[PDB]
Coordinates of C-alpha atoms and ligand atoms in Angstrom, one line a residue:
Chain A
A22 CA 0.0 0.0 0.0
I23 CA 3.2 2.2 0.3
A24 CA 2.6 4.9 -2.4
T25 CA 5.5 7.2 -3.3
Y26 CA 5.4 11.0 -2.7
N27 CA 5.4 11.3 -6.6
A28 CA 2.3 9.1 -6.8
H29 CA 0.4 11.9 -4.9
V30 CA 1.9 14.6 -7.3
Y31 CA 0.9 12.4 -10.3
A32 CA -2.7 12.3 -8.9
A33 CA -2.7 16.1 -8.4
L34 CA -1.3 16.6 -12.0
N35 CA -4.1 14.3 -13.3
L36 CA -6.8 16.6 -11.7
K37 CA -5.2 19.8 -13.1
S38 CA -5.4 18.1 -16.6
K39 CA -9.2 18.1 -16.2
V40 CA -9.3 22.0 -15.9
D41 CA -11.7 22.4 -18.9
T42 CA -14.3 20.3 -17.1
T43 CA -13.6 21.3 -13.4
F44 CA -16.5 23.0 -11.4
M45 CA -17.0 24.3 -7.9
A46 CA -20.4 23.8 -6.3
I47 CA -22.2 25.3 -3.4
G48 CA -25.0 23.6 -1.4
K49 CA -26.7 22.7 1.9
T50 CA -29.5 25.3 2.0
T51 CA -30.9 23.8 5.3
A52 CA -29.3 24.4 8.7
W53 CA -26.8 22.1 10.4
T54 CA -27.9 20.5 13.7
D55 CA -25.6 23.1 15.4
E56 CA -25.0 26.1 13.1
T57 CA -22.0 27.2 15.2
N58 CA -20.4 23.7 14.9
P59 CA -20.7 22.1 11.4
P60 CA -20.2 18.3 11.1
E61 CA -16.9 16.9 9.7
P62 CA -17.1 16.1 6.0
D63 CA -17.8 12.4 5.3
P64 CA -15.6 11.0 2.5
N65 CA -18.3 8.6 1.4
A66 CA -20.2 11.6 -0.1
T67 CA -20.7 11.4 -3.9
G68 CA -22.2 14.9 -4.2
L69 CA -23.4 17.9 -2.1
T70 CA -26.5 18.0 0.1
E71 CA -29.0 20.4 -1.4
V72 CA -26.8 21.4 -4.4
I73 CA -27.6 25.1 -5.4
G74 CA -25.3 25.3 -8.5
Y75 CA -22.1 24.7 -10.3
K76 CA -19.4 27.3 -11.2
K77 CA -16.3 26.8 -13.4
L78 CA -13.0 27.6 -11.5
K79 CA -11.3 31.0 -11.9
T80 CA -8.0 29.4 -10.9
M81 CA -6.7 25.9 -10.5
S82 CA -3.0 25.3 -9.7
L83 CA -0.7 22.8 -8.1
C84 CA 0.9 24.1 -4.8
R85 CA 2.8 23.3 -1.6
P86 CA 3.2 25.1 1.8
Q87 CA 5.9 27.8 2.0
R88 CA 9.0 26.8 4.0
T89 CA 9.7 28.7 7.3
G90 CA 12.8 30.5 5.8
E91 CA 11.7 30.6 2.1
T92 CA 11.3 33.9 0.2
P93 CA 9.2 32.5 -2.7
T94 CA 9.9 33.7 -6.3
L95 CA 6.7 32.0 -7.5
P96 CA 3.1 33.3 -6.7
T97 CA 1.7 32.8 -3.1
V98 CA -1.9 32.5 -1.8
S99 CA -2.3 33.6 1.8
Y100 CA -5.1 31.4 3.2
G101 CA -5.7 32.8 6.7
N102 CA -2.4 32.4 8.8
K103 CA -0.8 29.8 6.3
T104 CA 1.1 30.6 3.0
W105 CA 1.0 28.3 -0.1
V106 CA 3.4 28.5 -3.1
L107 CA 1.7 28.0 -6.5
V108 CA 3.8 25.7 -8.7
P109 CA 3.5 25.4 -12.5
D110 CA 2.9 21.8 -13.9
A111 CA 6.6 21.5 -15.2
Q112 CA 8.0 21.9 -11.6
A113 CA 5.4 19.6 -10.0
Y114 CA 7.9 16.8 -9.0
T115 CA 10.9 19.1 -8.4
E116 CA 8.8 21.2 -5.9
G117 CA 6.9 18.2 -4.6
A118 CA 3.5 19.9 -5.2
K119 CA 1.1 17.1 -3.9
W120 CA -1.6 19.8 -3.0
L121 CA -4.1 21.4 -5.3
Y122 CA -5.4 25.0 -5.1
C123 CA -8.9 25.9 -6.4
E124 CA -10.6 29.2 -6.6
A125 CA -14.1 30.4 -7.8
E126 CA -16.4 33.4 -7.3
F127 CA -20.2 33.3 -6.9
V128 CA -21.3 36.7 -8.2
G129 CA -24.9 37.6 -7.2
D130 CA -27.9 35.9 -8.8
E131 CA -25.8 33.9 -11.4
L132 CA -26.9 31.0 -9.2
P133 CA -30.0 31.0 -6.9
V134 CA -29.5 33.3 -3.9
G135 CA -29.7 32.2 -0.2
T136 CA -27.7 30.4 2.5
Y137 CA -25.1 27.7 1.8
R138 CA -22.9 25.5 4.0
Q139 CA -21.1 23.3 1.5
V140 CA -18.3 23.9 -1.1
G141 CA -17.0 21.1 -3.4
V142 CA -14.9 20.5 -6.5
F143 CA -16.2 18.3 -9.4
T144 CA -14.2 17.1 -12.4
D145 CA -15.6 15.7 -15.6
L146 CA -18.8 17.7 -15.3
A147 CA -21.0 17.3 -18.4
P148 CA -22.9 20.6 -19.2
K149 CA -26.1 19.8 -21.1
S150 CA -25.4 20.1 -24.9
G151 CA -25.8 23.7 -26.0
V152 CA -24.4 25.4 -22.8
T153 CA -21.0 27.1 -22.5
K154 CA -21.8 29.5 -19.5
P155 CA -19.7 29.0 -16.3
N156 CA -22.7 29.2 -14.0
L157 CA -24.8 26.0 -14.2
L158 CA -28.1 25.2 -12.3
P159 CA -28.4 21.5 -11.3
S160 CA -31.1 21.2 -14.1
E161 CA -28.4 22.5 -16.6
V162 CA -25.8 19.8 -15.8
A163 CA -26.0 16.5 -17.8
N164 CA -23.7 14.5 -15.5
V165 CA -22.1 16.1 -12.4
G166 CA -18.9 14.2 -12.9
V167 CA -16.8 13.2 -9.8
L168 CA -16.9 15.0 -6.4
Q169 CA -13.1 15.2 -5.7
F170 CA -13.1 17.2 -2.4
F171 CA -15.6 19.2 -0.4
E172 CA -15.9 21.2 2.9
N173 CA -18.6 21.8 5.5
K174 CA -18.7 25.3 7.0
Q175 CA -20.8 27.9 8.8
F176 CA -23.6 29.4 6.7
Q177 CA -23.0 32.3 4.4
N178 CA -25.8 34.3 2.9
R179 CA -25.7 35.3 -0.8
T180 CA -27.8 38.1 -2.3
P181 CA -27.8 39.5 -5.9
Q182 CA -25.5 42.2 -4.4
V183 CA -23.0 39.7 -2.8
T184 CA -19.9 38.2 -4.5
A185 CA -18.6 35.1 -2.6
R186 CA -15.0 34.2 -3.3
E187 CA -14.5 30.6 -2.4
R188 CA -10.9 29.2 -2.4
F189 CA -9.5 25.9 -1.0
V190 CA -6.4 23.8 -0.8
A191 CA -6.7 20.0 -0.9
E192 CA -3.9 17.5 -0.2
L193 CA -3.7 14.4 -2.5
Chain B
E14 CA -20.5 43.6 -0.6
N15 CA -17.8 40.8 -1.1
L16 CA -17.2 37.6 1.0
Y17 CA -13.8 35.8 1.2
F18 CA -13.1 32.3 2.6
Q19 CA -10.0 30.0 2.5
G20 CA -10.4 26.4 3.8
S21 CA -9.2 22.8 4.3
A22 CA -11.2 20.4 2.3
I23 CA -10.8 16.6 2.6
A24 CA -10.6 14.2 -0.4
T25 CA -13.6 11.9 -1.0
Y26 CA -13.5 8.1 -1.1
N27 CA -14.3 8.4 -4.9
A28 CA -11.2 10.7 -5.4
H29 CA -9.0 7.6 -4.4
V30 CA -11.0 5.4 -6.8
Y31 CA -10.6 8.0 -9.6
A32 CA -6.8 8.0 -8.9
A33 CA -6.8 4.2 -9.1
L34 CA -8.8 4.3 -12.4
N35 CA -6.3 6.9 -13.7
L36 CA -3.4 4.4 -13.1
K37 CA -5.4 1.5 -14.8
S38 CA -5.7 3.8 -17.9
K39 CA -1.9 3.8 -18.2
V40 CA -1.8 0.0 -18.7
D41 CA -0.1 0.2 -22.1
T42 CA 2.9 1.9 -20.4
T43 CA 2.9 0.2 -17.0
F44 CA 5.9 -1.9 -15.9
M45 CA 6.9 -3.9 -12.8
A46 CA 10.5 -3.7 -11.9
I47 CA 12.7 -5.9 -9.7
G48 CA 15.9 -4.7 -7.9
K49 CA 18.2 -4.8 -4.8
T50 CA 20.7 -7.5 -5.8
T51 CA 22.8 -6.8 -2.6
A52 CA 21.7 -8.1 0.8
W53 CA 19.8 -5.8 3.4
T54 CA 21.7 -5.0 6.6
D55 CA 19.4 -7.6 8.2
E56 CA 18.2 -10.0 5.6
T57 CA 15.4 -11.3 7.9
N58 CA 14.1 -7.8 8.6
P59 CA 14.0 -5.5 5.5
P60 CA 13.9 -1.7 6.0
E61 CA 10.6 0.3 5.6
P62 CA 10.3 1.7 2.0
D63 CA 11.0 5.4 1.9
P64 CA 8.3 7.3 -0.2
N65 CA 10.9 9.8 -1.4
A66 CA 12.3 7.1 -3.8
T67 CA 12.1 7.9 -7.5
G68 CA 13.4 4.4 -8.5
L69 CA 14.6 1.1 -7.2
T70 CA 18.2 0.8 -5.7
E71 CA 20.1 -1.8 -7.9
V72 CA 17.4 -2.1 -10.6
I73 CA 17.7 -5.4 -12.5
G74 CA 15.0 -4.9 -15.2
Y75 CA 11.5 -3.9 -16.1
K76 CA 8.7 -6.3 -17.2
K77 CA 5.3 -5.2 -18.5
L78 CA 2.4 -6.3 -16.3
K79 CA 0.6 -9.6 -16.9
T80 CA -2.5 -8.3 -15.0
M81 CA -3.5 -4.9 -13.7
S82 CA -6.9 -4.6 -12.0
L83 CA -8.8 -2.5 -9.5
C84 CA -9.7 -4.4 -6.3
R85 CA -10.8 -4.2 -2.7
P86 CA -10.5 -6.5 0.4
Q87 CA -13.1 -9.2 0.8
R88 CA -15.8 -8.5 3.4
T89 CA -15.9 -10.8 6.5
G90 CA -19.3 -12.5 5.5
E91 CA -18.8 -12.1 1.7
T92 CA -18.8 -15.2 -0.7
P93 CA -17.3 -13.4 -3.7
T94 CA -18.7 -14.0 -7.2
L95 CA -15.8 -12.0 -8.8
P96 CA -12.1 -13.3 -9.0
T97 CA -10.0 -13.3 -5.8
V98 CA -6.2 -12.9 -5.1
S99 CA -3.9 -13.1 -2.0
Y100 CA -1.6 -10.3 -0.8
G101 CA -0.2 -9.4 2.6
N102 CA -2.3 -11.8 4.8
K103 CA -5.7 -11.0 3.2
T104 CA -7.8 -11.8 0.2
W105 CA -8.7 -9.1 -2.5
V106 CA -11.8 -9.1 -4.8
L107 CA -10.8 -8.0 -8.4
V108 CA -13.3 -5.4 -9.6
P109 CA -13.8 -4.5 -13.3
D110 CA -13.5 -0.7 -14.1
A111 CA -17.3 -0.3 -14.6
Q112 CA -18.0 -1.3 -10.9
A113 CA -15.1 0.8 -9.5
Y114 CA -17.3 3.3 -7.6
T115 CA -20.1 0.8 -6.8
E116 CA -17.6 -1.6 -5.2
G117 CA -15.4 1.2 -3.7
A118 CA -12.2 -0.3 -5.2
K119 CA -9.6 2.3 -4.1
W120 CA -6.9 -0.4 -4.3
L121 CA -4.8 -1.5 -7.3
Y122 CA -3.7 -5.1 -8.1
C123 CA -0.6 -5.6 -10.2
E124 CA 1.0 -8.9 -11.4
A125 CA 4.0 -9.6 -13.6
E126 CA 5.8 -12.9 -14.6
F127 CA 9.6 -12.9 -14.5
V128 CA 10.3 -16.0 -16.7
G129 CA 13.9 -17.3 -16.5
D130 CA 16.7 -15.3 -18.1
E131 CA 14.4 -12.7 -19.9
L132 CA 16.0 -10.4 -17.3
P133 CA 19.4 -11.0 -15.5
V134 CA 19.2 -14.0 -13.1
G135 CA 19.9 -13.8 -9.3
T136 CA 18.6 -12.5 -6.0
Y137 CA 16.1 -9.6 -5.7
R138 CA 14.6 -7.8 -2.7
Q139 CA 12.6 -4.9 -4.3
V140 CA 9.4 -4.8 -6.4
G141 CA 8.0 -1.6 -7.8
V142 CA 5.4 -0.4 -10.4
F143 CA 6.3 2.4 -13.0
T144 CA 3.8 4.2 -15.2
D145 CA 4.7 6.1 -18.4
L146 CA 7.8 4.1 -19.0
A147 CA 9.5 5.0 -22.3
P148 CA 11.2 2.1 -24.1
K149 CA 14.2 3.3 -26.2
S150 CA 12.8 4.2 -29.7
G151 CA 9.9 2.1 -31.1
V152 CA 10.7 -1.1 -29.2
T153 CA 7.9 -3.4 -28.1
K154 CA 9.3 -6.3 -26.0
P155 CA 7.9 -6.6 -22.5
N156 CA 11.3 -7.4 -20.9
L157 CA 13.6 -4.3 -20.6
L158 CA 17.1 -4.0 -19.2
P159 CA 17.8 -0.6 -17.5
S160 CA 20.1 0.2 -20.5
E161 CA 17.0 -0.4 -22.8
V162 CA 14.7 2.2 -21.0
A163 CA 14.7 5.8 -22.4
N164 CA 12.7 7.3 -19.4
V165 CA 11.7 5.0 -16.5
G166 CA 8.4 7.1 -16.0
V167 CA 7.0 7.5 -12.5
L168 CA 7.6 5.0 -9.7
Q169 CA 4.1 4.8 -8.3
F170 CA 4.6 2.2 -5.5
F171 CA 7.3 -0.2 -4.4
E172 CA 8.1 -2.8 -1.7
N173 CA 11.1 -3.9 0.3
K174 CA 11.0 -7.7 1.1
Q175 CA 13.1 -10.7 1.9
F176 CA 15.2 -12.0 -1.1
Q177 CA 13.9 -14.3 -3.8
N178 CA 16.2 -16.2 -6.2
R179 CA 15.6 -16.4 -10.0
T180 CA 17.4 -18.9 -12.3
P181 CA 16.9 -19.5 -16.1
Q182 CA 14.6 -22.4 -15.0
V183 CA 12.5 -20.3 -12.5
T184 CA 9.3 -18.3 -13.3
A185 CA 8.6 -15.8 -10.5
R186 CA 5.0 -14.5 -10.3
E187 CA 5.1 -11.2 -8.4
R188 CA 1.8 -9.8 -7.2
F189 CA 1.1 -6.7 -5.0
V190 CA -1.9 -4.7 -3.9
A191 CA -1.5 -0.9 -3.3
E192 CA -3.9 1.5 -1.7
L193 CA -4.6 4.9 -3.4
Ligands
CL1 CL1 -16.3 26.9 9.4

């Protein structure tokens, strides 16, 4: 079962290759049992609970945590308190980038407005023939693809005047 | 008004199955290698495999897989319909690609036959699987000497075990199950 470090990088590179068909979803319109303490995400999930809609990623890149004494030349994303170094595909193995960075914005009413508690990334999403737009209602997706990673968090309310920028880093 | 969030998302069970399916898709360029001609410090207790390894120590040769299939451990009360194999101390149920997610097959089964002198004879202590192996030019043969490989590809998983001896009269059937 002993996989190499490079096996994880290979898996991350494989996800990045699916960029043209990678979408970030928002869901869970209904309240958690405890709104202040969301339950831990169960890996057996094949999709989001009460999926609202799908949004094509603004950015998808391989990455790795910054070293303590490193002054990075490459771009950095500063997720609250911890810095990540974005690595181009060619330096994947040399940099040991076994993590994947994903970013997407939910601008106003492009998807139905309301509360949401879930964020997840799907690869190989089939938009119904005749649709190119990055914002897809669940009735507009032909086959949701494969839910790769998701997160359960405290509710956020979205209005036609609100732009929600959702970004996350997943280890592979 | 604008909202900003940065979080720690966990991989799904299906993400592991997807990774295993991705390796199976590389079947045409997947090779099993054998190595470590020299004895371990303690021949009876081999050292734990270091994941930072990019290849095998004293690589002997590369042999294209006889079988590569997705699999999962057999359940305690299961009487499997599908084919079964033995690795570690357990039994594994071989699952076809179509039933990958339904069966939750996040493990990969690989098998290769090392028939006699097709690769240099002697003792070996390592077994590893490589994907995207480039044979020098347009060569087709399944048995490749390290001097015959143009680019070894990506060492996906390997094992350190007690020695096995191969002679021109011996056929070694190496099987291993790796979790993804
Ligand atoms: Cl939270």
